[PDB]
Design an enzyme around this catalytic site. Structure first.
Site, PDB file in Angstrom:
ATOM      1  N   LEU A 103      -9.246 -10.895   0.073  1.00  0.00           N
ATOM      2  CA  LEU A 103      -9.996 -10.711  -1.185  1.00  0.00           C
ATOM      3  C   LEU A 103      -8.985 -10.947  -2.309  1.00  0.00           C
ATOM      4  CD1 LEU A 103     -12.039  -7.566  -0.222  1.00  0.00           C
ATOM      5  CD2 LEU A 103     -12.926  -9.839  -0.506  1.00  0.00           C
ATOM      6  N   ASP A 127     -11.700   8.400   0.199  1.00  0.00           N
ATOM      7  CA  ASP A 127     -10.658   7.996  -0.771  1.00  0.00           C
ATOM      8  C   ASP A 127     -11.227   6.934  -1.729  1.00  0.00           C
ATOM      9  OD1 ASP A 127      -8.180   8.142  -2.011  1.00  0.00           O
ATOM     10  OD2 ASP A 127      -7.177   6.784  -0.551  1.00  0.00           O
ATOM     11  N   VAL A 181       1.236  -6.020   2.623  1.00  0.00           N
ATOM     12  CA  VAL A 181       0.084  -6.902   2.849  1.00  0.00           C
ATOM     13  C   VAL A 181       0.451  -8.302   2.453  1.00  0.00           C
ATOM     14  CG1 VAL A 181      -2.357  -7.384   2.369  1.00  0.00           C
ATOM     15  CG2 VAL A 181      -1.523  -5.027   2.364  1.00  0.00           C
ATOM     16  N   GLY A 193       0.851  -1.166   0.000  1.00  0.00           N
ATOM     17  CA  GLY A 193       0.000   0.000   0.000  1.00  0.00           C
ATOM     18  C   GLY A 193       0.893   1.223   0.000  1.00  0.00           C
TER      19      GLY A 193
END
Ligand SMILES: Nc1ncnc2c1ncn2[C@@H]1O[C@H](COP(=O)(O)OP(=O)(O)O)[C@@H](O)[C@H]1O
Ligand SMILES: [Mn+2]
Ligand SMILES: [Mn+2]
Length: 287
Positions: A90, A132, A26, A21
């Site tokens: 996801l 955002d 992640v 990010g």
């Protein structure tokens, strides 16, 4: 925060890296008891400078949301100088990733917009503003479900603080009233959704080739962006409804769920697996 936990490896195992990010990394992970795969965002607080405010807001906001349209939060853990934020995994790619192989068709655009709108309606009903919204923050599962992500700059309205005024977001998608630092509310996310609709239709937001500082005067001054081209009139009208310079004239997320563009074009989310498979093929064949 109050429910910060410790010793995450007692309950989870960290697996391979799956994303990067703005600030942290992640990873895929797995619950050691259920064997359910999860995502772990790891933040080095030692590295953390003036982005720490945003880390606390992200955990606070995630912890307070309980919706099929918002990345589910499992908990936050402290591990030496790092913070592990554990969330729903996801694996389908973000909507921005899914645009790489080629354009979307209107059924795909309406289906993704409809799910984003269900997430926005949930957030706004909780007095939260995402601030955002853009395709890069819309994440899909491998089976086609669509969820909102990245809550580090989310805002919270209260009984007395009925508006926010902080200058936050990503320039190209920012509403004019946010850029001017005028009092604003959930309608700012409706403007960002209109910009995201153009992004889903054209692959990039308006002004994407200009330096972001330039858009800080182009946005308040210019007429709002419009969608031109071989797009159905209802999609152009959906964009126009969102992109009104006066916030009180923009519809709410709930109203947009009944817009003719959404009603006549959105289909089951499972059809989005064809888009997810296209990105997988595309990524593999990539030179
Ligand atoms: N729950 C998740 N499942 C799968 N990948 C994720 C998840 N959360 C984040 N990612 C990966 O991390 C990327 C950046 O995440 P984001 O929340 O936008 O981070 P940041 O606040 O550090 O910029 C996503 O765009 C994606 O590629
Ligand atoms: Mn993001
Ligand atoms: Mn963030």
């Amino acid at each position: 925060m109050q429910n910060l936990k410790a010793d995450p490896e007692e309950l989870f195992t960290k697996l391979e890296k799956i994303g990067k990010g703005s600030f942290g990394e992640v990873f895929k992970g797995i619950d050691n008891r259920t064997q359910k795969v999860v995502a772990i965002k790891i933040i080095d607080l030692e590295e953390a400078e003036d982005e720490i405010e945003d880390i606390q807001q992200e955990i606070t906001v995630l912890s307070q949301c309980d919706s099929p349209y918002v990345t589910k939060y499992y908990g936050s853990y402290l591990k030496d100088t790092k913070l592990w934020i554990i969330m729903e995994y996801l694996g389908g790619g973000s909507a921005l990733d899914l645009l790489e192989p080629g354009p979307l068709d209107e059924t795909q655009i309406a289906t993704i917009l409809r799910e984003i709108l269900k997430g926005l309606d949930y957030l706004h009903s909780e007095k939260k503003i995402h601030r955002d919204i853009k395709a890069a923050n819309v994440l899909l599962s491998e089976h086609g479900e669509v969820k909102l992500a990245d809550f580090g700059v989310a805002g919270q309205l209260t009984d007395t603080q009925i508006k926010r005024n902080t200058f936050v977001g990503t320039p190209f998608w920012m509403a004019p009233e946010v850029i001017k630092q005028s009092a604003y509310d959930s309608k700012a996310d409706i403007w960002s959704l209109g910009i995201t609709a153009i992004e889903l239709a054209r692959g990039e937001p308006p002004h994407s080739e200009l330096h972001p500082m330039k858009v800080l005067f182009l946005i308040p001054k210019n007429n709002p962006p419009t969608l031109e081209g071989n797009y159905s009139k209802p999609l152009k009208e959906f964009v126009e409804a969102c992109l009104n310079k006066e916030p009180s004239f923009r519809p709410t997320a709930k109203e947009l769920l009944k817009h003719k563009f959404i009603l006549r074009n959105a289909k089951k989310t499972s059809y989005l697996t064809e888009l997810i498979d296209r990105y997988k093929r595309w990524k593999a064949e990539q030179s």
